């Protein structure tokens, strides 16, 4: 069934919590001061680039995403990327502790992220606990995230296919959350998520302009989409 394949796809795309990765983690007390250097930017960029790989291996595994055309397959992806990056990160992070947890299991302190991400990081954590107040069970999240991906995108081959897959996922979510308006409180989180992507596009524009290290292709593509 569709739900099951969405739960699994989510759970496979997630970090292994038995192996969160603390090799870079440090519990800092005082803000990192100054301007950000090339190391800050390169980290931020790698984290970005890392997640695209995983979000794609998550995409593939959605019932009938592989079935679509290669044109739309990468278009739903690059267009959903930043929103997926932020929502998955907000979902799996730990705002009480100041821990950002990334798709590869990497754990970073809010204060370690602040130079590359900017004040954006603080809004992302605000959005994290906002998600966490509400409670969003795994099946609700595993449908919500596929809906961020499979959605009409100006310039899609057969948006009938996308629109069709979309509505199945949409009724899984509707059904599952009726089995558990709840759905509309969860949907009431996506305007917050939208504000987050805009601020992220702005930091990424700002970093593109310092040009301290060459961006990864995703930075360009996400920015070209503007």
UniProtKB/Swiss-Prot annotation:
<protein>
    <recommendedName>
        <fullName>Nuclear receptor subfamily 4 group A member 1</fullName>
    </recommendedName>
</protein>
<comment type="function">
    <text>Orphan nuclear receptor. Binds the NGFI-B response element (NBRE) 5'-AAAGGTCA-3'. Binds 9-cis-retinoic acid outside of its ligand-binding (NR LBD) domain. Participates in energy homeostasis by sequestrating the kinase STK11 in the nucleus, thereby attenuating cytoplasmic AMPK activation. Regulates the inflammatory response in macrophages by regulating metabolic adaptations during inflammation, including repressing the transcription of genes involved in the citric acid cycle (TCA). Inhibits NF-kappa-B signaling by binding to low-affinity NF-kappa-B binding sites, such as at the IL2 promoter.</text>
</comment>
<feature type="domain" description="NR LBD">
    <location>
        <begin position="1"/>
        <end position="226"/>
    </location>
</feature>
<comment type="subunit">
    <text>Binds the NGFI-B response element (NBRE) as a monomer. Binds the Nur response element (NurRE), consisting of two inverse NBRE-related octanucleotide repeats separated by 6 base-pairs, as a dimer. Interacts (via N-terminus) with NLRP3 (via LRR repeat domain); the interaction is direct, requires binding of NR4A1/Nur77 to NBRE-containing dsDNA and lipopolysaccharide, and leads to non-canonical NLRP3 inflammasome activation. Interacts with GADD45GIP1. Interacts with STK11. Interacts with IFI27.</text>
</comment>
<feature type="region of interest" description="AF-2">
    <location>
        <begin position="215"/>
        <end position="226"/>
    </location>
</feature>
<feature type="region of interest" description="Binds lipopolysaccharide">
    <location>
        <begin position="159"/>
        <end position="180"/>
    </location>
</feature>
<comment type="function">
    <text>In the cytosol, upon its detection of both bacterial lipopolysaccharide (LPS) and NBRE-containing mitochondrial DNA released by GSDMD pores during pyroptosis, it promotes non-canonical NLRP3 inflammasome activation by stimulating association of NLRP3 and NEK7.</text>
</comment>
<comment type="similarity">
    <text>Belongs to the nuclear hormone receptor family. NR4 subfamily.</text>
</comment>
């Amino acid at each position: 069934n569709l739900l099951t394949s969405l739960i699994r796809a989510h759970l496979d795309s997630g970090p292994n919590t038995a192996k969160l990765d603390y090799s870079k983690f440090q519990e800092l007390v005082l803000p990192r001061f100054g301007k950000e250097d090339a190391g800050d930017v390169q980290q931020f960029y790698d984290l970005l680039s890392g997640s695209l790989d995983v979000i794609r291996k998550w995409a593939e595994k959605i019932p009938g995403f592989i079935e679509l055309s290669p044109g739309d397959q990468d278009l739903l992806l690059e267009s959903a990327f930043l929103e997926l990056f932020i929502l998955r990160l907000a979902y799996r992070s730990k705002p009480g502790e100041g821990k950002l947890i990334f798709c590869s299991g990497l754990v970073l302190h809010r204060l370690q992220c602040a130079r590359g991400f900017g004040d954006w990081i603080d809004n992302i954590l605000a959005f994290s606990r906002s998600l966490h107040s509400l409670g969003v069970d795994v099946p609700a999240f595993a449908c919500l995230s596929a809906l961020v991906l499979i959605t009409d995108r100006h310039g899609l081959q057969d948006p009938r296919r996308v629109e069709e897959l979309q509505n199945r996922i949409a009724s899984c979510l509707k059904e599952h959350m009726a089995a558990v308006s709840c759905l509309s409180r969860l949907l009431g989180k996506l305007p917050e998520l939208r504000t987050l992507c805009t601020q992220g596009l702005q930091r990424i524009f700002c970093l593109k302009l310092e040009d301290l290290v060459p961006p990864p292709p995703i930075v360009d593509k996400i920015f070209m989409d503007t």
